[PDB]
Amino acid sequence: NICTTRGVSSCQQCLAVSPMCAWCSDEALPLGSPRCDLKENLLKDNCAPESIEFPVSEARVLEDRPLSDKGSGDSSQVTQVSPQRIALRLRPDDSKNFSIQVRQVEDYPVDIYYLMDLSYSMKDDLWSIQNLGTKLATQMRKLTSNLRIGFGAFVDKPVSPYMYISPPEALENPCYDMKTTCLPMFGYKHVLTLTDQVTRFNEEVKKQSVSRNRDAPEGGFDAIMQATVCDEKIGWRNDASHLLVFTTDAKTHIALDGRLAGIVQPNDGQCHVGSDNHYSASTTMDYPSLGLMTEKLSQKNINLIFAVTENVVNLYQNYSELIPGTTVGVLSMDSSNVLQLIVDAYGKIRSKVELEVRDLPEELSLSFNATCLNNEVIPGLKSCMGLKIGDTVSFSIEAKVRGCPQEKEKSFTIKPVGFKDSLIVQVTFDCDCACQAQAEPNSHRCNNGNGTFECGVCRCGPGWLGSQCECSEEDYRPSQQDECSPREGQPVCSQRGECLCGQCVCHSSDFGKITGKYCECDDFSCVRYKGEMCSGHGQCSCGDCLCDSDWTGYYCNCTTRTDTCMSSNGLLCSGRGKCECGSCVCIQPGSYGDTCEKCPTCPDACTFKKECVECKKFDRGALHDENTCNRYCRDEIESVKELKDTGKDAVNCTYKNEDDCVVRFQYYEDSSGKSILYVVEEPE
Amino acid sequence: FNLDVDSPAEYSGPEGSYFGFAVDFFVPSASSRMFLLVGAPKANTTQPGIVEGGQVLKCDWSSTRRCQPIEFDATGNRDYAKDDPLEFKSHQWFGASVRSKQDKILACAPLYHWRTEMKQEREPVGTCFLQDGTKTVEYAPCRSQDIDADGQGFCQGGFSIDFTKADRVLLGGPGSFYWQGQLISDQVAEIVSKYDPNVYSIKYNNQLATRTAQAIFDDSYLGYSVAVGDFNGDGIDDFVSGVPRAARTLGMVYIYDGKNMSSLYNFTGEQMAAYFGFSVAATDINGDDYADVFIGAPLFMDRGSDGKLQEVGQVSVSLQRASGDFQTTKLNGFEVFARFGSAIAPLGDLDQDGFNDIAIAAPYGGEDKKGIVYIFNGRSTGLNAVPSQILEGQWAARSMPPSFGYSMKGATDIDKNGYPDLIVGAFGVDRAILYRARPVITVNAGLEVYPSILNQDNKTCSLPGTALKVSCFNVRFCLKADGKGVLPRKLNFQVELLLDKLKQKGAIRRALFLYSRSPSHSKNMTISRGGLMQCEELIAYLRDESEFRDKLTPITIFMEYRLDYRTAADTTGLQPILNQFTPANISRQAHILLDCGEDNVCKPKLEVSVDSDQKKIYIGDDNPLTLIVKAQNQGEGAYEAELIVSIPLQADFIGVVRNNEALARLSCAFKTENQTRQVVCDLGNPMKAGTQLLAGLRFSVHQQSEMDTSVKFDLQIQSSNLFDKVSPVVSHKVDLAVLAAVEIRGVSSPDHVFLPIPNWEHKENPETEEDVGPVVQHIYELRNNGPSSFSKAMLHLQWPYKYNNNTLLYILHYDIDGPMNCTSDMEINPLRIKLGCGVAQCLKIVCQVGRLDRGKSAILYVKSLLWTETFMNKENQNHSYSLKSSASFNVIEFPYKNLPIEDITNSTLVTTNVTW
């Protein structure tokens, strides 16, 4: 038993050794018996069961309201996360596991804020959306019943470089030189507060007009920040989906670009939209950085959609990768297809669920195992994708503590990205045992006082040592042979200490503390990897570098986060391997690359799909016999009778059935990410 | 680490004037005094009708911290004609950039607008003023006749400036040519001589300037920041400039030849919008005379634990090499949103250790966001990645982040004490602060105890005033101090000396000083800065045997020394500082005689043996290398015995074997010192007579030089014994091995073809693939998986070409990926279209491949057409085709010529079935 060899000194020290250690506070315990070891072995010494101090960690569910089935109802009833609050109690170095459920409730309210670029290039676009309010309402009516629409516009900071300032007529009509009239330049103007009277959208849009700026890049991000943080002005509903449609056809200014204009004050992320609906700090505050934009988007639960023209889709595709939770769509030069763009983007947003952690204590660590559709379990992954509206997914979370912290109560939140609903975890630590409540300092129970009696042996103060503190510091008589050596022939305290009255006292230490009845244990001599010693993601006790819950290995040099193993298509290691320490290890021949995606010699792509079409056409196949084929048939299936050869990348493939007939089918995928295949109705 | 943070000199400017936006030193060669230059771009001035014209202030040192403006320009806006202003100086941000060199001062106004001489426009060309002693001349290279925004109209020349060694000015305008940016360089002599107040578009003869380029480069902001250094060895400073928006906003840094403005090198960022290039600096950081490039990316986002992106900032350090290539390493920030890397200021040799240093600012870090500055020291191997000091802003925000560290300047010894100093700007609160470098003293301590082995029966000396004889030993300690720069002749040191320092708490100490009776002794020593070591002696004696028990634990003699800085402070109160990387204490050990009994001295006989299971090692792999070492003493006890392991060029230590049962566990250690590297493990202090010890150590070894064929280990045992100090030396050898495991594999798409072919008919002459039949692709991959690479190899492809006088598959066109070149014995596509070879006539293809390393592979792509006419002939003949193809390879030469080569060969088989 590890507990006997390291603790035994006191109740608190015993329980901190390991989760399974137990302490006996019964004074009737036989003299010389081990006072600290696992309960089942301890009880054999007839220690009073009521006097045993063996706390056990637990997770208790406080608020658990069932997941809702429909978004149409009351604000306080809709529930997409369950349980909603959980009480967690942990021992000094123990861990507990709990679960969570997430549902993409159908018919949930939606808020759409249309943030439009109004440079002179978008004059054609402003004409196309003159009836978008009615058309958008009709299309969204089949997805939600509580739609709300708002509008806003931006050009760029109305300052030098960016603005025309000569002739003085150009200030009042930047299009003066083109013999045409356009509005004076503006940074960001809020037009329509999110409202359900969709007719107002048409009225407001019909009154807008474009402006003109000098340089090519625009000031969109500076407007995204204000559309995000000015919640009361914009009118975001907390219990609704927030879509921010950002439309533009040009490059964008970024942080530190404002220095050319004489603007050096960093963006503060506050709301500066005044009573006139104009962003007042436009000319005195720099553009926001991507980090601040991401932080503010996450806090307000806003999904940002980049609806941009093809000449800049690649740029915003790369920007979107640095702002997780955002979508990009190709906008027509006329903005005629923005409605379908919005509708498609909304489907993509609700097809994915990803968890998020807030205010996690530094001493804690979490590991997730996601249970996506069809009971698929992906260890280490905290997100699913490919969902439909109304689907349910579940996760399993395990929390571990890096030793007993000073604070006794702490809390953190687990929340899906873009959701208001969240799980609140209340963490408690019970490092100190109950018997300590009746400590008796300097009592007659302790030799000459000079100590404290608590839960058992007295805690000897200065000038005394040994059981009952009977031996003074000045005695150290050598007549004792009280087992003060790991094994005869080796020094009494392994040269790390000196034996006094039979108990070793460890001498100076380099950069830690020494422990053990032979001073054989310490917390600073652990193993090393490429000269780093313990990796720092874990404990270092008795020479062992012990890692957190999300780190592993004798050296704690191995991660468990799976982001680096995520393929571009969105499934783990391209389905050809497992992540290990953040590096996919391929399990099928020929697969190589960072995510096992480079396989050149893998069989013909249609070969894999033939096994799926077997599942989706006929009652045969091992996967079908397993009933697991629905897991592997992620692709869309459509039946035909003549192969649709009208495709540039459609793979026409065939195979010989177990029956005499021949099977015909095709496959392809497009930029939208959808993967589809056609199957002939009847085999030939 | 030697910057004085306790009493810095603080300067203050007008409220709201951005005083401290740009800082620099002023060292006029004509005068002894030296000043600070501080730019206040928003300061109100006395010019007629000018609002927020900007100012440059000259602040002096060694006196009242008083700042006075420099009168670069006392006039207002000139008039092109009656009531038609030529220029608009209001809000011109004069002083946004300041530089000086000897007696020259150059300050610029990036936001200076002027009305061109051809229209009534208002264009920010930017202007600069150069003060050369008594003469002041305006310098506006971008105020030319190329007026529109497609020319130099919006240049904003002077956004960043610098001086070269040859008295050239480098000026950057990030707005030229639709914000492509521009660099302009002129000779200071030509600027002064060619000046004319009545000419607004002066032309300079020897000007160097970049030129407009394709529209794809618009909005790059070339010239956002500039630096100068030599990067081609001709002794003429070249131009380094940051382009933060280049390459899809990845950021770039251009290096231009300093003599004809031709491009030399380009650096590119790794993350978009990180603003790679916000700041740049060129300085030699490793003392090899080759300038090194530093590039800041304030908004860089890295991934922390759990992979979340956080905006910490990054600085890229590039060490120049004689070969013309740069060895680059990255350095990340420490706090989120602190914008680490905003400013980079070469400090020169801050501590006079022989290598230059550098400071990097995070103007929004620290408590709240008052700002922080990090100081990094340079080593012979490059920059030291751990900051040796941290400066913290002390002024809270008034209405804007203080931005302490947004601008810095160093490498000038303002107080002439021999160490360069530093200025930090805090334009957010309108302040500038000067940090002075403290002199650094290096102290060499000494401590020795001659009678190390104490015989408690060797009563030699007697206690003072008593008849008792005691065994006593001498303790001798010394001090030596030296340092560069202005330092006092004599340094006062206080020394505290402890006997039996391992005793703690109330435990009795076994040794005491003779003249006194305490176990501790303290002395004040006066050290003169010089090479001769100064020493002092004391006599210590063992306590009588009756008073103490422990005879085994060694007696530790401990010395620590302190320097009273208050006494050594110079006339201005600048205190010295001890060197950071030298210990303040030194220790020795004295051992009681553990009954060796031979002749009251101990004769040890140290011997060892070494062995391993890795009889051979491969070039590179998951090295499990290990060593099992035997150590024994066949003589009398050995004091402070320890095992030393020496390793060759490439090697590493993993630790002692922990899991094994019979394997003894030891507290081994690893250090590198005296241009050598070793593992050290204490075998026991002392090792007892006849002691036997067995231990095992884990290593890691990979080879890359190809220069040798085997790896070695040399071992030794050392002790403190009088005579048999060292053990006989032993060596261990392991041979290198080459294992370039390689495999050849292929696939066929489709795996089968079914006839009759839909939508096909026979034709007299085919012209397109569908006239011939369905397409077939055969693919092969040559891959290397083994620990070892190979430099060249060859592969063969055997492919049927005629059976029963029928063509079978028909070659169309090649495709490959890797370092090989191929050839075939028969024509490719002999007809101009836009069941193996053992029974059928064959076509053969040959290809030779170059170097394939571990995990690399080469792929051959062959796409062909199934001549379905021949297969209709087959169907008439009514047989079946399991049409087949095969390939093979052979490795021909390893890059490890020094090692024995072994033949590796294999083959693969592919097929494509054809059935009705």
The residue ranges of every structural domain in chain B are 440-592, 606-737, 742-915
Candidates B224, B622, B683, B749, partner chain A, best to mutate (most A CBs within 10 A): B749
Closest CA to B591 of B446, B451, B448, B471: B451
Nearest CB to B754: which of A257, A564, A662? A662
Residues of A in contact with B311 (CB under 8 A): 289-292
Q: Which residues have a Cβ under 8 Å from the Cβ of B400 and sit 6 or more positions away? A: A265, B428
Are B392 and B366 within 8 A, CB to CB? yes
Nearest CB to A251: which of B121, B219, B401? B219
- What is the distance between the alpha carbons of residues B162 and B166, in angstroms, rounded to a whole number? 12
- B754–A656: do the CB atoms touch at under 8 Å? yes
Burial code of A494-504, b = ≥16 C-beta within 10 A, e = fewer?
bbbbbbbbbbb
Q: Which two tokens stand for residue A484?
A: 């003060």
Are A667 and A606 within 8 A, CB to CB? yes
Q: Which two tokens stand for residue A434?
A: 């109950």
Are B511 and B543 within 8 A, CB to CB? yes
- A527–B248: do the CB atoms touch at under 8 Å? no
Q: Which two tokens stand for residue A112?
A: 């759409």
**How close A265 gets to chain B, by Cα (Å)?**
7
Q: Helix, strand, or coil here: B151?
A: coil
For residue B651, the chain A residue with the least C-alpha distance is A530
Q: Which two tokens stand for residue A489?
A: 């022939």
Residues of A in contact with B93 (CB under 8 A): 262
Q: Which two tokens stand for residue B107?
A: 């300050």
- What is the distance between the alpha carbons of residues B829 and B766, in angstroms, rounded to a whole number? 12
Read off the amino acid at residue B246. Answer: A
- What is the distance between the alpha carbons of residues A342 and A112, in angstroms, rounded to a whole number? 9
- What is the distance between the alpha carbons of residues B606 and B603, in angstroms, rounded to a whole number? 10
Q: Which two tokens stand for residue A393?
A: 């997914």
**How close B502 gets to chain A, by Cα (Å)?**
7
- A167–B336: do the CB atoms touch at under 8 Å? no
Burial code of B874-911, b = ≥16 C-beta within 10 A, e = fewer?
bbeeeeebebbbbbebebeebbbeebeeeebeeebebb
Chain B, 59-118: which have a CB under 8 Å from a chain A CB?
91, 93, 110-111, 113, 115
Nearest CB to A161: which of B124, B244, B859? B124
- What is the distance between the alpha carbons of residues B119 and B143, in angstroms, rounded to a whole number? 14
Q: Which two tokens stand for residue B531?
A: 């090479």
**How close B568 gets to chain A, by Cα (Å)?**
32
Instruction: Reply yes or no: is the peptide bond before residue A184 cis, omega within 30 of 0.
Output: no
Candidates A260, A479, A549, partner chain B, best to mutate (most B CBs within 10 A): A260
For B440-592, CATH gives 2.60.40.1460
Q: What technique solved it? A: cryo-EM
Is A218 known to sit in a ligand binding site?
yes
Radius of gyration of chain A (CA): 34
The answer to whether residue B175 neighbours chain A at the CB level (below 8 Å) is yes
Are B700 and B659 within 8 A, CB to CB? no
> What backbone phi and psi angles, to 5 degrees, belong to B211?
-125, 160
- What is the distance between the alpha carbons of residues B222 and B241, in angstroms, rounded to a whole number? 7
- What is the distance between the alpha carbons of residues B494 and B564, in angstroms, rounded to a whole number? 8
Chain B, 777-836: which have a CB under 8 Å from a chain A CB?
779-781
Q: Helix, strand, or coil here: B156?
A: coil
The answer to whether residue B655 neighbours chain A at the CB level (below 8 Å) is yes
Q: How many CB pairs under 8 A join A and B?
A: 159
For residue A498, the chain B residue with the least C-alpha distance is B550
Looking at the domain B606-737, which fold is it? Answer: Immunoglobulin-like (2.60.40)
What is the Cα B775 distance to its own chain's centre?
A: 53
For residue B279, the chain A residue with the least C-alpha distance is A256
- A216–B218: do the CB atoms touch at under 8 Å? yes
For residue A604, the chain B residue with the least C-alpha distance is B749
- A662–B779: do the CB atoms touch at under 8 Å? no
- Residue B859 burial by Cβ neighbours in a 10 Å radius (0-12, 13-18, 19+): middle
Nearest CB to B655: which of A266, A476, A528? A528
Q: What angle do CA A634, A636, A641 make, to 5 degrees?
A: 140
CA torsion through residues B589, B595, B598, B603, sign? negative
Closest CA to B632 of B602, B652, B660, B606: B606
Candidates A473, A498, A544, partner chain B, best to mutate (most B CBs within 10 A): A498
- Residue A43 burial by Cβ neighbours in a 10 Å radius (0-12, 13-18, 19+): middle
**How close A61 gets to chain B, by Cα (Å)?**
26
Q: Please tell me the CATH superfamily of domain B742-915, with its number.
A: ntegrin, alpha v. Chain A, domain 4 (2.60.40.1530)
- B113–A160: do the CB atoms touch at under 8 Å? yes
Q: Which two tokens stand for residue A119?
A: 């440079």
Site of tokens 């503060």: A268
Is A119 known to sit in a ligand binding site?
yes
Q: Residue A232 belongs to what H/E stretch?
A: helix A231-234
The answer to whether residue B515 neighbours chain A at the CB level (below 8 Å) is no
The answer to whether residue B664 neighbours chain A at the CB level (below 8 Å) is no
For residue A537, the chain B residue with the least C-alpha distance is B305
**How close A604 gets to chain B, by Cα (Å)?**
6
CA A356 → CA A229, A353, A383, A417, A570, distances in Å? Answer: 20, 10, 9, 6, 18
Are A375 and A627 within 8 A, CB to CB? no
Is B421 known to sit in a ligand binding site?
yes
Residues of B in contact with A607 (CB under 8 A): 751
Is A563 known to sit in a ligand binding site?
no
Nearest CB to B219: which of A216, A322, A564? A216
- What is the distance between the alpha carbons of residues B218 and A9, in angstroms, rounded to a whole number? 73
**How close A429 gets to chain B, by Cα (Å)?**
24
What's the distance, Cα to Cα, between the start and end of chain A in Å?
Answer: 71
- A160–B124: do the CB atoms touch at under 8 Å? yes
For residue A656, the chain B residue with the least C-alpha distance is B754
Q: Residue A319 belongs to what H/E stretch?
A: helix A313-321
What is the Cα A424 distance to its own chain's centre?
A: 15
For residue B576, how many C-alpha atoms fall within 13 Å in the half-sphere facing its CB? 28
Residues of A in contact with B655 (CB under 8 A): 527-528
Chain B, 458-487: which have a CB under 8 Å from a chain A CB?
none
Q: Determine how β-strand A675-680 pairs with β-strand A636-640.
A: parallel
Read off the amino acid at residue B573. Answer: G
Candidates B751, B753, B908, B914, partner chain A, best to mutate (most A CBs within 10 A): B751
- What is the distance between the alpha carbons of residues B75 and B46, in angstroms, rounded to a whole number? 9
- What is the distance between the alpha carbons of residues A398 and A539, in angstroms, rounded to a whole number? 18
Are B648 and B702 within 8 A, CB to CB? no
